[PDB]
Every structure is written in C-alpha cells, then in structure tokens.
C-alpha cells in the first residue's frame, strides 16, 4: 500500500535497457527497466514449480504488471533452469485469457507484447556487443513468445500490417530497422495458405541488401523435403545435420515435425527400444514440437504397448517432463494408461519387476494431483504391495537363481553362491566393454546383463554396496567409462560419497550427446540439494590452480552451477552465504574486479583503480536476479556499518544508504535494492537489521526533519522514504520486535507544523499521513509517551497530545483514507491508555477529549465525513 499512487501513474509504458558508461568499460548489460518489481513474485516463479501455482496467482489480481513482467522473467534467465517455463508462461496467460470480463485490457496485451518484441530489435542497433547478447537472447525469448503467442492469442494478418506500418519509417536506411524486420518475419511460423502472399511480398519489399532475398517460401519446401527424407530411412547423422543448417530458420523445422508426426501414428507396428529414444531425442532437437512429442506418446499409450524393458525406458521420459507434464492435460487418461499397461503386461520374464521409478512417478502424481478418484486410487495401492511382496520374497535364493538362469540361459552354470563376486566383476566387464562402442550387433545381450546386475543388487544391499566399493577401490575403470556407468546401473550416492578429486568434477558434468537413457534427474537432483557440497569442492578445487584442466573447469562449472540453480527461497539462502564468502574472503581490490567477472557471466550465459560507487551502479542495473546483488550489498553494508567507531558508522552508513538510494531514484527498482539490502542485512544479523532500520529511522527522521523547513520534491522523496521504511517496519515486525528509536522533537514538529495551516495540510497530504501513519504504526513509541504523562508532575499540557488533538479537527476531508486512519490512530491511543491503567489509576483527564472524537456510531460517524 505504501506505492500505491505509483501504480495509477503507469499507463502504456515500454522498455528500454541502456548500459553505464562505467558499466560499458567492464561490458556490463543493462536490465530493462520495470514499471512494477513483484519480486516476491519473482521469487514465487523459481519455487513455482511441481506446485499448484496457477490457481493461487488468480488470488492477486497482478495481471496489467505481472504478466508483462512475467514474459521477462521467462526470457531471461533459464537455458536449463526452467524446461517448462515458455509453456508455464503461455498457460498463465491462457489463464488470464480465460478469466475475461472486458474488451479492453485483454487483447491489446498482446499487442503490447509484440510492440516489447519489436523493442528487443530496437536495442541491438549496430554494432554494440553488450547490447546483442541482449537483443539475441531477447531475439530467442521473442521466437518463443511467438510460438506460445501465435497458438492461444496472436493474429498473422495484425502482425503482418504492424511490420508493415514499421518498415515506413525506415525508409532512410537504419542498420537496427532491417535486420529486426526480416529476423522477426522469418520465424513467425503463419499458415503455409496464408503466409504466401503476405510474407514474399514483405520479403520482396525487404529484398535489397538481403541474403535470405527471393523464394523465402521455396526454401521451407526445401527444408521439409530435407527434414523427410533423412527421417524415413536411416541418416541419424543426417537428422543431426540438418538441425545445425537450420538453425537459421525455425519455422521450416515446425513444418516437418508435422509430417513426421503424421507418418509415426500411422504405423501400426508399436514403437520400441532405442527406436523411440531416437525418434523424440531427434524431435526434441527441434523446439517447435513440443506438444507433438507428447501427442505421440499418448497415441502409443492409446495403440498396442511396447516391450516391457522399453516400457520402464519411455517413463523416464515422463519423469524428465516434470512440469511440462501437466501440459498435456491427459493426467486422467494416463492414469488409466498406467493401469492398462499393468493389466497388459503378461509375457515378462522379469522376477523383479522394479516400479521404483514408476512407484515415485504415482507419489507424484498423488501429491500433484490433490484429488480422489475410483480408478486411479485402486491402481496406486495395488502397485505399491507387488513391490513390497517381491522384496519380501527377494531373500529366498530360487526366484533369484530361476531370474539369473533364464538370462544366462545355462542351468549348470547356477551361479547361486558369490553370484555377487563373480557376476558383479562380470556385469562390470561386460557392461564397459561393449557401452561406449554401442555397436553391438544384438540390443538384447546387454538389457540382460542389466537386468541380472539389477536382480543381484536387489537381492543384496550391502554384497551390492561392498561391491561397488571394491570397483572403486581397483580403479581399473577409465573416468569417461564410470559416467556412463552410473547413468544406467551404478548408483551417484555411492559415487558422491567416495570420489577423486579429478572424479569430481567429471561427475558433475556428463555428455549426452550420444543416444542413451535419460539421465536428467539425478543430476538435476544432486544440485537441487545443497549449496555446501558445490562451495565446497570449488574452493578446494580454486585454491591448487594447477595443469589447466581440473583448475580451469572448477571455476566454469562455479560461475555455471550457479546461473543453472533456480534462485529457490532455500537456494538464496545458500547463494547469499556462498556469494558473501567470496565476496568477504577476496583480500586484494583486483579480486574486487573478479567479481565484475559474475556479473558479465549472468548478463551473457553463452556456453582505472575506482571506488564504492561505480559497484554500486553495478548492483543498481539488475533486474530479477538479484541474489548476487543482494549478497554483494549485504557484504559492503556490513563492511560499513562495522567501522568499529560509534562515530564512523553514523558518518558512511548514512552517506552509502542514501546514494545507494539516490543512484536508484525509481520504485519498483528501490524497493527491490532497499529490501535485498535489509533481506540481506536481516539475514546475516538480525540484530545489526534492526540497527541498520535505527539507522534509517535517524536518517528518514532527518529527512522528515527537513520537510517544514524544505516544502519541496515530496513525491520523489516519499515513494523512496514509504519503501524503505515499510521495508524496515516489515523486517521489525518479522523480527518480532517493537522497539524503535526515538526522535520526539522531529515528529512533534512535523505535528504542529502540519496542524498551523490548512492549506498546507491539503497540499501534499497522501505523503504527510502515510509518514505519520507509519510512524505511529507501531505502539512502542506511544506507550512510552504515556509514561511520561504519568510521569509529569500536575496537569501540564503534552506536547503530542495537543499536535494529535490539532490534526484531528485539521484532518477534514483531506482523504478518504486519510480519515480513516487518523480514526484508527486515535482509537488505537485510546486503548493503549486503558491498557497503561491497569495498576492503580493514574489521572490524565484527557481522555474525555479524545473520547468523544473517534466513535463508531451515530452523528460522530457522519462527523468524520
């Protein structure tokens, strides 16, 4: 509430991100401007989800500003971070959509959406390097904006006329103008009907100095007979080729997965094994598609099931999907789709028959799902006790001999005892043999080994673990080799627990580039997890510098773990204390310089001595992403508060607070600074928190102060003050408590300066009572007032008493809002004065005065009015 005159000001607002000059030297990228923070909405996008977000957002009614803010937050920042994030975004707007009561305000938004898009091209202009990074990652967040646009809200002929009307103005030849046209025409995925006539002639029109120049239509011709041919027989090579020349255009891609789409449902025979890794990895490459792929899956879910083995393989997929999942909307289905492959399956020769994966995928499916339906619930316990059952029944050694034999396919050789001793070294030998290669000539011998290494380690636990520990401890397994051991059957725990140094950071990253099973989760997993493991093995692994390989990967994989972690509530937590240790730890001001390294990092994400102020233009920049800004100035605020002189703090405390203010000079922006800086500052300490507000109380007080004497610049000066204040009255009331500092003669003054004149309590008046309303928010200040009465010797008039009794009959029709809370004010000292004679009574006389003010019935009511 206290930005609410902010809010009303805004109107068809737009954009533009321009570097610093200081900035521009360290090739820094500036953050687009924003009319509205909703960080805490920000914050609420990475925790966002595997989590009911959708219908809790509908609560707030952020959609004029958050929405728009929202495209940015999905554009910016995640590569690998936020898989489902185009689409998340294009559901929150599918849901706005829906929920429409009027013309006005729904449709434009898209409009306001290209005008953005058509701003990123803006931005580029020519030749600027900070600037492209941002434009092109604004250029592939545009394109995806696009594909999610197009399909719910978008119309090809509204977008076809405004780059029309666009190309007009540039007709006296602008670098920017020209690219961004032909950029944003060449990908906008139209109807092959419709686009035709619209898009040649536009590329006509653009024809000179073009390279892509005439036939733009034949070239999708092209690409889709390319696409095809390559698709139906063999050319896995080719596949991956033919996404590399088509990277240029997007659309062209589009078109083909349609076709491809159409052929694999047509099969009757069913899809399985490698076949149908290969078929979505290849469509996967193509980012278009998305909803194809899922289609597919269902289809063969709907059509005659697949092998068993592959079965348990395809899951994994579903497993990867994660949010994405709940796009597709087939929840219902699937379920009876899970059910139906357990009511199919009839001819597996598994004992096991592990549903691990798939138990986990159900206990998702219940917790994400919140509802209780017939079908679904019975299916959920009975795969619970078939898995239970067979672990039971695991000890007993005749279903495990009778699994083992059936794949070795020899009776004699039973292998019953120490099948863990020699079956282990065996599974282990020919396992790494044949893997890499991936040129054996049958798919079904290593699914068999898989399967027996599988059974035994069930059987087993501790043998399972003893044995994994023994392999280690050889070392006769090449590092590349172990990767790709632990993706099918080894398990990351065992390898986490135990591992060389150089072992480390190769399990950090694996290569998947060649086909193999998913192994996304547990990766993904690992780094969900903790923030001390990571911080730990970098600075370890930073300190030896050595060889140029372990060294130079430890400090990517640092600056990259980091950009990957979602900025998560518990994850900033750990970010804030990573960050402030190197930040805190680097002893040299060149380090200092290091850090300009960070920032460079998050703003590009492509796989002379100065002082205090250029960083804090540096902090100023940022946009959404602000948990290393939040540390950088947790640490410089600590820095300077702890001078170690009662002197010296008053002195640079005040003097940073308030240029770190001043150099914002903005709304949604300052808010986010003055809270990061007393998040981080109240997280660090809540005691030096609630200093830092003593602080800022002393120095809005002399702020306050200067208001009778100033009389000018009150909307800038407030909205700064309102924020920042909140912001510390928010950190007391989180830090349960109520103490404040006391500046009697500052608020006394303001008082009856406010009271003396009419006219000047009108001019202004949202400003002056939002101050005092605040100031007297909290009963910790007023309760010592009363004492003090008490205290006095006789009847000898208050000072604060007579400014309240003042602004009271002064406060006429001032506000609406204004009245009402003076009203509460004085209610609220009213009760605080019954609450303080509760002892023996002492005699105010005052009361009576103040009594007769404030009521809530009759002619008084009308009164305030």
């Given amino acids: 509430s206290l930005k609410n005159n902010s809010s009303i000001r805004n109107v068809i607002m737009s954009a533009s991100n321009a570097n ?18 909703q960080l805490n909405c920000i914050d609420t996008q990475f925790t966002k989800l595997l989590d009911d977000n959708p219908t809790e957002f509908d609560w707030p009614t952020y959609v004029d500003q958050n929405p728009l803010t929202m495209h940015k937050i999905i554009q910016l920042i995640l590569w690998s971070i936020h898989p489902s994030r185009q689409f998340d975004h294009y559901e929150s707007n599918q849901l706005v959509a829906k929920l429409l009561l009027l013309r006005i305000n729904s449709t434009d938004e898209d409009l306001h959406e290209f005008q953005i898009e058509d701003a990123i091209w803006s931005l580029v202009f020519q030749l600027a390097k900070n600037f492209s990074a941002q434009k092109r990652v604004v250029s592939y967040m545009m394109p995806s904006l696009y594909r999610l646009l197009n399909i719910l809200i978008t119309y090809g002929i509204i977008k076809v006329p405004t780059y029309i009307r666009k190309l007009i103005s540039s007709g006296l030849l602008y670098l920017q103008d020209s690219n961004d046209k032909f950029v944003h025409v060449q990908l906008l995925i139209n109807l092959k009907i419709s686009p035709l006539m619209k898009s040649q002639y536009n590329m006509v029109l653009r024809n000179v100095m073009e390279y892509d120049v005439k036939f733009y239509e034949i070239f999708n011709f092209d690409q889709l007979v390319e696409i095809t041919e390559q698709i139906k027989m063999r050319i896995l090579s080719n596949d991956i080729t033919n996404l590399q020349l088509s990277k240029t255009p997007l659309s062209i891609k589009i078109m083909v997965a349609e076709w491809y789409l159409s052929h694999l449902c047509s099969g009757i ?36 099931q ?59 499916f219940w917790k994400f799902f919140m509802k209780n339906f017939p079908f679904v619930l019975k299916v959920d316990n009975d795969l619970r006790i078939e898995l239970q059952s067979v672990y039971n029944d695991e000890k007993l050694k005749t279903e495990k001999l009778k699994n083992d034999k059936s794949e070795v396919l020899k009776v004699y050789s039973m292998i019953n005892n120490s099948n863990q001793a020699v079956g282990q070294t065996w599974n282990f030998p020919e396992v790494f043999q044949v893997n890499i290669r991936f040129l054996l ?35 006769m397994s090449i590092f590349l080799k172990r990767k790709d051991f632990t993706n099918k059957n080894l398990i990351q725990l065992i390898s986490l627990k135990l591992l060389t140094f150089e072992v480390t950071q190769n399990v950090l990253g694996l290569e998947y580039i060649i086909r193999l099973l998913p192994i996304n989760l547990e990766n993904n997993d690992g780094s969900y997890g903790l923030f001390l493991k990571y911080h730990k093995e970098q600075f370890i692994k ?29 994850l900033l937590k750990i970010l804030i204390t990573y960050g402030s240790s190197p930040k805190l730890l680097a002893t040299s001001t060149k380090i200092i310089m290091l850090l300009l390294n960070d920032s460079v990092e998050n703003s590009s994400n492509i796989l002379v001595d100065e002082i205090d102020h250029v960083e804090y233009y540096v902090m100023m920049d940022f946009a959404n992403l602000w948990v290393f800004q939040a540390f950088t100035c947790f640490c410089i605020k600590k820095i300077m508060e702890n001078n170690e002189p009662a002197m010296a703090m008053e002195d640079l405390k005040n003097f940073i607070f308030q240029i770190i203010e001043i150099t914002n000079s903005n709304d949604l922006c300052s808010q986010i ?15 030096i928190v609630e200093k830092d507000f003593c602080t800022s109380c002393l120095q809005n007080n002399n702020q306050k102060i200067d208001d009778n004497y100033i009389v000018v610049v009150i ?15 928010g950190m007391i009331v989180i830090s349960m408590e109520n103490y404040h500092l006391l500046i009697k003669i500052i608020r006394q003054l303001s008082e009856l300066n406010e009271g003396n004149l009419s006219k000047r309590e009108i001019q202004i008046d949202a400003v002056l009572k939002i101050f005092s309303f605040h ?33 009271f009959n002064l406060r006429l029709k001032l506000f609406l809002y204004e009245i009402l809370s003076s009203l509460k004010s004085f209610a609220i000292y009213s009760s605080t004065i019954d609450a303080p004679a509760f002892h023996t009574s002492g005699k105010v006389e005052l009361p009576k005065k103040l009594l007769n003010l404030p009521p809530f019935q009759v002619s008084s009511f009308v009164k305030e009015t």
């Fill in 20 to 37: 610093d000059f200081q900035l521009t030297i360290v090739t820094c990228k500036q953050f687009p401007k924003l009319s509205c923070i």
């Fill in 269 to 304: 025979l069913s899809s399985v094994n490698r076949t149908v890794l290969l078929k979505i990895f290849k469509i996967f490459c193509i980012d278009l598609e998305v909803f194809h792929h899922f289609f597919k899956w269902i289809e063969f879910i709907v059509y005659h």
């Fill in 306 to 364: 697949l092998l068993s083995d592959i079965e348990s393989l395809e899951a994994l997929m579903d497993i990867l999907l994660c949010y994405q999942k709940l796009f597709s909307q087939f929840i219902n289905d699937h379920i009876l789709f899970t059910k139906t492959f357990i009511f199919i399956y009839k001819k597996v020769l598994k004992e096991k028959d592990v549903p691990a994966y798939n138990v986990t995928s159900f206990m998702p």
């Fill in 441 to 475: 000539h049958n798919s079904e011998i290593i699914d068999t080994n898989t399967s027996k290494q599988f059974q035994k380690a069930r059987n087993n636990v501790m043998l399972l673990i003893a044995t994994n520990l023994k392999e280690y401890n050889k070392f």
């Fill in 542 to 570: 930073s300190n030896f510098e050595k060889i140029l390989l372990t060294c130079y990967e430890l400090e990517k994989k640092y600056h990259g773990n980091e950009c990957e972690i979602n900025y998560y509530e518990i």
């Fill in 673 to 687: 600074f003055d809270q990061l800086k007393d998040m981080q500052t109240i997280e660090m300490i809540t005691q």
């Fill in 715 to 729: 909307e800038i000066i407030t909205s700064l003050s309102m924020r920042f204040q909140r912001e510390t009255s």
């Fill in 775 to 807: 100031q007297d928010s909290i009963f910790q200040r007023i309760i010592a007032d009363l004492s003090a009465d008490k205290p006095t010797s006789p009847f000898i008039d208050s000072i604060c008493k007579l400014f309240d009794k003042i602004s």
